[model samples]
Target: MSPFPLTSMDKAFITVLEMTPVLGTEIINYRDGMGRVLAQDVYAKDNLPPFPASVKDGYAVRAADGPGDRFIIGESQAGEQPTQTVMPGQVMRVTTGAPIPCGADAVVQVEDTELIRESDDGTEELEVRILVQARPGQDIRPIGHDIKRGECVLAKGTHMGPSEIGLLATVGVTEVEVNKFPVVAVMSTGNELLNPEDDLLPGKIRDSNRSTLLATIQEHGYPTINLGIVGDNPDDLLNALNEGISRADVIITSGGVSMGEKDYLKQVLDIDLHAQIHFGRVFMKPGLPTTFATLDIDGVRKIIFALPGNPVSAVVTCNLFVVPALRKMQGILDPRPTIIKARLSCDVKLDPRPEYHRCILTWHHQEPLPWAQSTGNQMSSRLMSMRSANGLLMLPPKTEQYVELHKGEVVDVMVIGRL
Candidate 1:
């Protein structure tokens, strides 16, 4: 029997998102815009190349000047224009990316022609014989061929990545409006907790949840504060949570939300902060006690995600719930966890609650889905269960007829890390 109403994982996820707000925008240098969401459309200020550029080291000529010898009027190297025009019976020497001379509409590859004359000092190609018939526009990039002025290169809500950042540079955009990254405050609560460095006292364990959760927040590129640890006392939780609310956009706490006698975070939130407890529990195996809440202090809404106490559970739920909310806060268009199809590598028992079983996903070119091999000994407290796990296999609740999933069965897996 549960102490609180159980909510489906989908319902709990949606409810958490119901109150999640996209953060306001900020102007930042495009160089620092990696992984940031674009709040403004990026329009091109000018045409790419801005001129007719030679695509190869060739002679610039008129198409009418078919295969024949022509005097070299001038050499147009990259970044410079030919002072003399390529007239009839005349060709302009050019290198790749050099602007086509005043009167040339075609280019002939140097390999397709033979040098007929040179300077006395062998310093210039005085003349060349064209071997191939020239086309109207050959081996030349015309104005706006790559990008046109006033064209929108990247639209609003674009997730700025490597290529988008380069596009900003190419389009002459030095700064852009991007959504602000959410600042997260992480804390842990338990009477049996101690700092990881401190030697363990009688009946005390080092708090691994805080350390893991903090690292996870940092790994996702969000700013985070270490709210440290507090006991299971209501006053302690009340003060720590208040501090978290005042200091950061999202407050994440581990432990003290379960059914233990010392669990008082829910009480502190309800009585002291008057928070709206959206959901008290989830119908999931490792994170059944996951709690999501929101409250307004002075009309400013603050989010709270109270994850389970178990080490593996905290880590798993942080990736499942916390990261997505933080992503939403940063104005990501689709902030849901990315789920992919995967095949099980071995047999595994299903729990009564739908489980997010940790596993390593490996790929094969021949298979339609990646292979997921579970990290053995999946007890919620066993931190090893999360070792090298890149995906969470979504295992359904066991039925009387289907107590276990067999080897090579296809399942949905949420991708958490790189393969």
Candidate 2:
């Protein structure tokens, strides 16, 4: 048996997050800041739509004037100012996004009016009939309606999504300061592993963990350093670790973590590298043998995640642990996976360890909440279980009673991908 006991998944997560440090900041254009985290609070430089603007193509009129045929004064289109001011018996034709006339307090939509008379050439609107009462401020966007000057529009540590980018553009922000993303080094360790292009031998399998992990890290907007595949020899593993520590902020290795004859990664990290092994085992299904370690070289602290050899276990642990750590390093305030309540579509049995069951979440037109269906067998070696799966049903360990979850039972699901 190993010297360390198994740690709960929750405690392991807390320890990893607590040990992770946020990266530095850099200035970049807002157009290229999608998926980045804001390093400082952003404030609006000026009020949005500095003047009163029309929200629809209509006639600007005073609300107190009521419905009546009024004399046509002038017209105002977008990007231009109206030269003619409105009087008590006059109205100006305004297009959407045009500045309202100085004396008008409301806008009567074109649909609510009828043309009573016009010039012979139809070049000018002479008179129009209003059919409804115009309420003050209706259809008119007042100054600073969308954003106020000097107001904090986005806070520090805010993740920049599409809507947040739109808000930034609305506030006239062309450039912003954002947190830097850490460079991650990904590698696979095993003597029985072969490259994908190589022919399958009698006792070797093609390496899949490195490619999958590198793509997953890149999908989240981080720069990745491909460390390739390393053999089980202690010298080779030590060389790869040294290179990773020197070049990357985080190092991730797959295989060589379980109790086996060729499992030399933990030994190298603990003995040769003198790394601080935070946790060696976790109390979770499909990823119980995951190991996390931290090393300080030349005053720089680096993180290492030694994932299990199974393909499914590597993917599950990456989403549950590595992604959150990356988010934290990029300055996200709430660096956790999105959890939602979903109803089970079928019955599921529990295990001694908490199971992160791969599942597909579906939404029918008639259902209020989404329904989750298990992705067949929950085997650690079967990567097919993750296909079309967007959620991980968080099933707790079984008790003496309540060993199984029946259909229609509400459960908490961690959203890993798009629904």
Worst 10 residues of 1 by lDDT: 378-387
Put down candidate 2 lDDT per residue, 248-343, tens digits, no spaces. 999999998876665689999999999999999999998988999998876778899999988878888999999999999888889998999999
Give the clash count for each candidate: 0, 0
Candidate with best TM-score:
1
TM-score per model over all chains: 0.95, 0.90
Error of 1 at 235 (Å): 2.2
Question: Candidate 2: which pairs clash?
Answer: none
lDDT score at residue 155, model 2, on the 0-100 scale: 94
Tell me the deviation in Å of residue 28 in model 1: 0.6
